[PDB]
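User: Structure tokens for this complex, please. No commentary.
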Amino acid sequence: MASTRCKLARYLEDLEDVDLKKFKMHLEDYPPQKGCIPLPRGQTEKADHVDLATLMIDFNGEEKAWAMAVWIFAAINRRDLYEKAKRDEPKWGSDNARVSNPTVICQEDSIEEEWMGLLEYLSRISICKMKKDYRKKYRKYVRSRFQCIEESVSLNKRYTRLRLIKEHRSQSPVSPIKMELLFDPDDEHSEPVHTVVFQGAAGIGKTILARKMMLDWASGTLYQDRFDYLFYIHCREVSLVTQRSLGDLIMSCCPDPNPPIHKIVRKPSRILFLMDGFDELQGAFDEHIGPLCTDWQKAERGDILLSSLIRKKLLPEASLLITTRPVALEKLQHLLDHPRHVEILGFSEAKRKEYFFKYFSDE
Amino acid sequence: KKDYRKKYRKYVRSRFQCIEESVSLNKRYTRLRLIKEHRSQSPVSPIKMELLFDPDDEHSEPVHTVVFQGAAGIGKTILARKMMLDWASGTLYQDRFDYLFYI
Amino acid sequence: MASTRCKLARYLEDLEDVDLKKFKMHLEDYPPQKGCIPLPRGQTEKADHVDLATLMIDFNGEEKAWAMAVWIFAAINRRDLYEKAKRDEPKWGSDNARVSNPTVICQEDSIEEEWMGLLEYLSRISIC
Amino acid sequence: KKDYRKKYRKYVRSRFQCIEESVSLNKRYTRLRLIKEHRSQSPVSPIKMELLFDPDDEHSEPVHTVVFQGAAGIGKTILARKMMLDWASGTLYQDRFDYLFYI
Ligand SMILES: CC(C)(O)c1coc(S(=O)(=O)NC(=O)Nc2c3c(cc4c2CCC4)CCC3)c1
Ligand SMILES: CC(C)(O)c1coc(S(=O)(=O)NC(=O)Nc2c3c(cc4c2CCC4)CCC3)c1
Ligand SMILES: CC(C)(O)c1coc(S(=O)(=O)NC(=O)Nc2c3c(cc4c2CCC4)CCC3)c1
Ligand SMILES: Nc1ncnc2c1ncn2[C@@H]1O[C@H](COP(=O)(O)OP(=O)(O)O)[C@@H](O)[C@H]1O
Ligand SMILES: Nc1ncnc2c1ncn2[C@@H]1O[C@H](COP(=O)(O)OP(=O)(O)O)[C@@H](O)[C@H]1O
Ligand SMILES: Nc1ncnc2c1ncn2[C@@H]1O[C@H](COP(=O)(O)OP(=O)(O)O)[C@@H](O)[C@H]1O
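Assistant:
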């Protein structure tokens, strides 16, 4: 009963020659954002099976070495060894002494996929690092501000897959791109594109759509999970001469007593601002106002802050979504280039009845 | 996986015993006859418990429907309770199959 | 000037151990220039200086093996080795190899047939 | 494996001592003579403790039966208690063998 190094050596002894060569490449070339360290080519190539297991533990420690072995097994299509290592990770845990009262924890619950997953995050120091603290909080917070009055108590039940004919380039493919990859361009085309705009008549529901679009992705919900953050901002509160910074604008969404904005200032183009209603903007607004803004934290004028944000000169990679009234387009269209115009339409004949299916309680 | 398993198993297991005659069931097993209709247009293959759902070589991998024909009072109601009781502890039954639903 | 392998082996000896590790990594990761095939990781790491020079010649040929070394020396920043490789251009004759049955990439390959006898008669005049 | 081991060992160990003459047994060992009948149709191989069950080169790997012949009062009853007491602590005895059953 020694295992670990010996358990790993046993799987490695099951690799065919071709499999071993590839397993070793992967070790030597291990992808660099796991909290894992690749292994040197000399020692790796030279190592027999038991020595390779020892080398993996010496370089990365037990738990990471095991994770690396599992990933590589999948990668070289040895799914047998992938499933065997996955089922025999806390399998020596069953053959472990109770030691009477648990000094910290019994540790019996490690086979559970959620618990194994927790252990995988736990010792990551990179996946564990602060990723977890940044995620769950933001998600649940953005989620609980749109329900539970004691009519706005159910929203997804009131969905409809509202029409989304996205303006084909104004000088035939369908590509409705309603939710999945709506921001994404066609083949290449424009990878760093960030601006999308929705055109709909007054009262269509473009204000409703943003609340729904938030509510969808505010649980992951197979939405753009490859995108990290979304920022809802309706311009009812936003006004002129406010002289408030983006952080003040940001903290408006979630008033954190300890604003982590220094960590929100991370990975541009990984964060999306959902601006809502240009019509809501009340007051004068020069689309080409003289003074220019580039400072993120400076207390700047409300329209000026938007001016930089709309021009994206501040936060050059930040994505933007702007529900706009068609009549007010010429102001922003002259202001900003390459806008992903999206025409949104109301319910059809049958859909109108289907709305009453959502609404009414009796035939 | 652990939370999905142990619970379902013990639950499906404790609804068929411990009155204070239905207190022992596996003791009342018998390996009841199981001649599975050969295709209606010789191999034995009783397939009583192991791979009873499984076809022959390939044949039909995604097959899902099996039906038992027996006279009224044979014990087909009893068999399901036994077949549940068998696999409700793994018991070297189709452990390569995850869940069973008695109705 | 009979063997380029020996000259390549001497240059491998000149390489520092860190430079040799970089040289092995570069040989394994060699880019596709002049139809040159990169050495497999296991062979490069296990081979000593003499063996690696032989393996470089066996993999592509003496001329390509020397050319790969000159590029690798520049890549590993071994300027003295890179200058020496540019300074010395060995003759492409060949070193001693235990290829009694000749082998070529084509399926037909080569044999110990009449070709050998003809080559021997052509190169062997006085001894016999 | 751990739950099966320690328990069995200490248990088989504490039933042969500590009265308040049978209080020391290994001290009363002696390496008693063990001439194992050569096949009844010269090698020494006393095989007193190590590989006493083990055959010669191959010969009979799955052999299981060994029998001790001794006069009445020799100590064959004592030997089993000692042989248990030896291996009941591993004691570089047949640790490649898992369990022993005294009866
Ligand atoms: C094409 C053009 C210029 O006429 C146009 C495009 O969008 C607008 S708008 O003014 O901003 N939005 C609306 O008018 N919405 C609306 C409509 C009707 C009735 C009602 C509403 C709102 C509640 C009642 C009839 C059709 C449009 C105008
Ligand atoms: C072949 C055909 C059509 O006759 C047939 C096939 O299955 C049935 S059935 O009606 O549904 N089941 C029974 O009849 N079971 C039964 C039988 C006997 C006695 C008793 C019972 C139940 C308790 C007493 C004698 C043989 C059958 C009919
Ligand atoms: C060879 C044959 C047939 O005579 C034989 C082989 O073993 C036995 S036996 O009967 O079962 N065992 C004994 O007799 N033990 C014994 C002996 C002596 C004295 C005493 C004892 C027991 C205490 C006193 C003298 C020699 C033997 C008989
Ligand atoms: N998808 C939808 N399902 C049901 N009702 C909707 C939907 N979209 C909009 N509405 C209706 O529109 C009203 C709000 O419209 P709003 O979002 O303000 O349109 P706009 O933003 O174009 O003015 C709500 O009363 C709601 O009943
Ligand atoms: N394998 C069996 N062993 C003992 N008794 C059985 C067995 N199968 C059925 N029985 C008897 O049959 C009765 C229930 O039969 P049931 O399952 O209702 O048959 P069916 O479902 O064909 O009507 C029970 O009283 C039981 O005693
Ligand atoms: N190895 C030994 N050392 C000391 N005394 C022994 C030994 N073997 C047997 N005896 C003595 O023999 C007696 C028990 O003999 P027993 O094992 O019953 O022989 P058998 O089993 O042949 O009848 C004890 O009183 C003990 O003193």
